[PDB]
Amino acid sequence: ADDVVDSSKSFVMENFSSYHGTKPGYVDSIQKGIQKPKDDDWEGFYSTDNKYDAAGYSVDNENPLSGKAGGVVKVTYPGLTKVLALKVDNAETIKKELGLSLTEPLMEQVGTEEFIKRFGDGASRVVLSLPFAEGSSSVKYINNWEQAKALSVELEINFETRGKRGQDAMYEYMAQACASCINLDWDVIRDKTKTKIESLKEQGPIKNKMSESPNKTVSEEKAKQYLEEFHQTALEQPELSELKTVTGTNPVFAGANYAAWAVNVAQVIDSETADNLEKTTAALSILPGIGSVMGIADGAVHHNTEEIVAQSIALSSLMVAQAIPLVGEIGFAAYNFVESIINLFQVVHNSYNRPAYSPGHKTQPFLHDGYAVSWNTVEDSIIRTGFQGESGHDIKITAENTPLPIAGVLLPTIPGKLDVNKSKTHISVNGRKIRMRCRAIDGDVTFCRPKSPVYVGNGVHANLHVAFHRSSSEKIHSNEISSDSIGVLGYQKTKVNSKLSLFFEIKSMA
Amino acid sequence: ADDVVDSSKSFVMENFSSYHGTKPGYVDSIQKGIQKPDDWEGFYSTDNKYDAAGYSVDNENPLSGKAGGVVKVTYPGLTKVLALKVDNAETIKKELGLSLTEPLMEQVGTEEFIKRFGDGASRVVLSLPFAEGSSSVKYINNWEQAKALSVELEINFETRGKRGQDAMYEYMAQACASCINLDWDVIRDKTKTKIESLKEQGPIKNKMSESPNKTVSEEKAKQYLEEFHQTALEQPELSELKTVTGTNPVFAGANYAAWAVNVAQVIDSETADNLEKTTAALSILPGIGSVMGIADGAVHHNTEEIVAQSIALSSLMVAQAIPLVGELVDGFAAYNFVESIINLFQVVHNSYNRPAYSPGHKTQPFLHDGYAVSWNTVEDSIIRTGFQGESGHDIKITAENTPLPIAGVLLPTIPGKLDVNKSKTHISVNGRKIRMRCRAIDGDVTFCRPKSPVYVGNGVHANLHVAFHRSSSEKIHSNEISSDSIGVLGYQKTKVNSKLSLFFEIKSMA
Ligand SMILES: Nc1ncnc2c1ncn2[C@@H]1O[C@H](CO)[C@@H](OP(=O)(O)OC[C@H]2O[C@@H](n3ccc(=O)[nH]c3=O)[C@H](O)[C@@H]2OP(=O)(O)O)[C@H]1O
Ligand SMILES: Nc1ncnc2c1ncn2[C@@H]1O[C@H](CO)[C@@H](OP(=O)(O)OC[C@H]2O[C@@H](n3ccc(=O)[nH]c3=O)[C@H](O)[C@@H]2OP(=O)(O)O)[C@H]1O
């Protein structure tokens, strides 16, 4: 029973409350009471501790990509409720270890007075708790359907009531989570986008460049060539002044990428598709290259003001309009295309609003120059402190195709307190153990280089094993250490090396 | 107790032997007996004589120096091999109760330890995994106890009388009896011959005199080196190479030229004169896969004749490149350059000979089209069989820079006894839970689409949780299942999707 219950995340509480995402049509009826609609082990009423994750369940089930969002309700049990947190979601296992019938549904047994007596610690009923999702700190709550009749149901937010376009109300709600926060007013962005489209189409050079279009089907090459010309003249108008400035250096935001995006849109959108928003979002949502239009690259949302986002969407919208004659299959460019891409913006912004480990942190890979490197486990990414002695840390390394070298690794040191254990530090290439020569560059950085050549690639990976020696029991101090990364050096290309960075955290023992 | 000892890999054995790599100069002296020139201070050996040979290279010229040999050492009588499940010395003595003050390996040589752990043997040898990615073990012997070791010769690489490190690598290649077992004597002789005869071909003399034969931009040098490559490829010395390098863009003339330019740009006169320094320099360059014929997880140039043609061609191109973008005796191109690149071939061939999980097997990432995907853990990549019920499987997903979509996932099914549990199968994007709509393609293939758009990229990752239900307890026979992979589909490019493959293993329970 211990092997399945996280007794440390379990607790009894009075007036236990949680949140339930509710779809259009039930935001009012569900407030009359939770009732079962007419694997069985997990049949029950689901809720979560996080009202923002609840809202993710609120979208029209017939149009989940683009349909209407209903609401979130807050449900509360009177009296005392036991939250029983489980370390597995395998019902056969749970019933075996909790001494239950292996034939009857798990969530049915959880509702019986015998289960409540044995596992309720005096509460009127038991609710099961499990991790909400990989990458989330929320929990999901599983309620037995009959016990859930005792819930009072109160409104938290009705997205319909807001009266806004698309899914704006839902995403604007979710962006509250982060008060590093994209919190855009999409009403402003819709109005400014409309305005800029209408007025760009009446700019001389644009009117000029428009008349110069083949206007009939051509080749992807002349299409792209003409649309890159159209992009420059458009970007020269003052409705796009700020965009021109922010898209000028980064090659992801180049006109050729706008043009490639426009061409790809024309090819996959037929007439049936354009006259259904759901169908249009399904089709746009699987194309590559949307980060050129979104202004997203290198781990950051660059286009993060209403004005710049509207300019970019305005620009894209016109380029789509001009590509459709060249490669199509016409008001779509300014109607559903704008509605659909707006929702895609909202999806991706929300992703970047959510707490998440960046590349090379914990077990998230660092992808660079054809290499992929990562900490082997989470514990490897932690340098413990406050003790005399040793630790070891494993980094996985490979590359995507041909053999790429590994020159060495840069390691942190603390003169007096933290040093490289030169005996146990080594690297292994498909099992071949390679010793390293480690030489201090100065008091804070040591460079270790393999004593024979290291190459990685498709079918060839390495495990870099870093060993640290602590000569005191003194806790390291943030002052004492500058870099927060281990630097693995790839190939050499003003000769510089490809730098692959693994980020660590200092922590005390536990 | 049992927390630090793996009994399943411990045993007593009579005449326990193991292997020790021995550096040049000590191959005869060490047969006189094991004598010593603190927790792990001890004599090291391994169960794999081929891994032993990887310790045999001159410690002061490790990249290009001579290889010494491998000896076999045997203990007369009974020896206890004690396999341990961790390698932190402080952790061993705690959980075993020894003295936290004397070195572990010292305590391992005492009668009280041998009495308590020897299970009747005259001494105890410690066993630990040899390295990540390796099946071999390393043995740690108490230095005093090791005086009892008999020491026989297994191989002396010097005695073989071969150039470079050929004797060491040809020994290592015996491990695989999908084996690269080249005769480098043949390759060296054919390379010298082809270099000489190519230099006397009329069109090559002709094209040579067309060189600017002076420092020029690298854009120019590359243009000329590309003309030279094509000319040289038309000569009968390279006819096979012309054929095997014609389609794959990795083996294109331009990459040979880029390579040749880079070589010329890093080799100075001192470097060119020293084989060790030339290998260090050459070993950190990108693009060596062009010359080696290594791409897509395979060594394509796998016959003596084609390797020598590729080495011969690159040699001539370096010779043409040096006057255009270097400053040394062209000289280098036919001598230390050839000697050095040969050693790099041997290193990489040896990596590809060693057993290794391919991309998308176990926890090795599958890298393709900007994405990176992997099984979260070894167990995730196993679909267990022989029982009724459920299992879960986590797949990690991200991309290198801009937001790239995940369109869906192809999953195996068996009409009878293996189904996709549609309510537990979901994808989580930086914690945001996204449910899936799963529809069958045929009786053996289910396709699941996310219900909100999924994008991944720098700073945005996803966890795909696949859940399988087994209705019968019958074990899954080989006929029943076609693919050995789960197919995650990326962006759409005759429309086709980017295919990211995660390979699984059907196994009975244990
Ligand atoms: N008076 C009412 N009483 C009870 N239910 C009502 C009522 N009115 C409407 N419902 C709906 O009935 C379903 C079950 O409670 C839910 O919608 P769903 O679209 O089928 O719910 C869709 C899925 O979302 C899950 N989910 C939904 C919201 C949430 O916050 N968390 C979560 O995990 C559900 O478990 C369900 O999973 P399964 O159907 O795969 O088991 C709920 O919104
Ligand atoms: N009569 C002799 N008796 C004992 N040793 C002798 C003798 N003559 C020469 N030696 C050499 O002395 C060293 C200690 O045994 C070894 O070489 P190394 O270059 O220092 O060996 C380099 C490292 O490789 C390790 N290693 C070597 C071979 C192997 O098969 N496995 C392995 O893990 C060694 O333990 C060593 O670790 P340390 O440098 O931390 O001691 C060994 O080859």
Automatic annotation (TrEMBL), chain A:
<dbReference type="InterPro" id="IPR036799">
    <property type="entry name" value="Diphtheria_tox_rcpt-bd_dom_sf"/>
</dbReference>
<dbReference type="Pfam" id="PF02764">
    <property type="entry name" value="Diphtheria_T"/>
</dbReference>
<dbReference type="InterPro" id="IPR022406">
    <property type="entry name" value="Diphtheria_toxin_catalytic_dom"/>
</dbReference>
<feature type="domain" description="Diphtheria toxin receptor-binding">
    <location>
        <begin position="358"/>
        <end position="507"/>
    </location>
</feature>
<dbReference type="GO" id="GO:0047286">
    <property type="term" value="F:NAD+-diphthamide ADP-ribosyltransferase activity"/>
</dbReference>
<dbReference type="InterPro" id="IPR000512">
    <property type="entry name" value="Diphtheria_toxin"/>
</dbReference>
<dbReference type="GO" id="GO:0005615">
    <property type="term" value="C:extracellular space"/>
</dbReference>
<dbReference type="InterPro" id="IPR022404">
    <property type="entry name" value="Diphtheria_toxin_rcpt-bd_dom"/>
</dbReference>
<feature type="domain" description="Diphtheria toxin catalytic">
    <location>
        <begin position="1"/>
        <end position="179"/>
    </location>
</feature>
<protein>
    <submittedName>
        <fullName>Diphtheria toxin</fullName>
    </submittedName>
</protein>
<feature type="disulfide bond">
    <location>
        <begin position="178"/>
        <end position="181"/>
    </location>
</feature>
<feature type="disulfide bond">
    <location>
        <begin position="438"/>
        <end position="448"/>
    </location>
</feature>
<dbReference type="GO" id="GO:0090729">
    <property type="term" value="F:toxin activity"/>
</dbReference>
<dbReference type="InterPro" id="IPR036801">
    <property type="entry name" value="Diphtheria_tox_transloc_sf"/>
</dbReference>
<dbReference type="Pfam" id="PF02763">
    <property type="entry name" value="Diphtheria_C"/>
</dbReference>
<dbReference type="Pfam" id="PF01324">
    <property type="entry name" value="Diphtheria_R"/>
</dbReference>
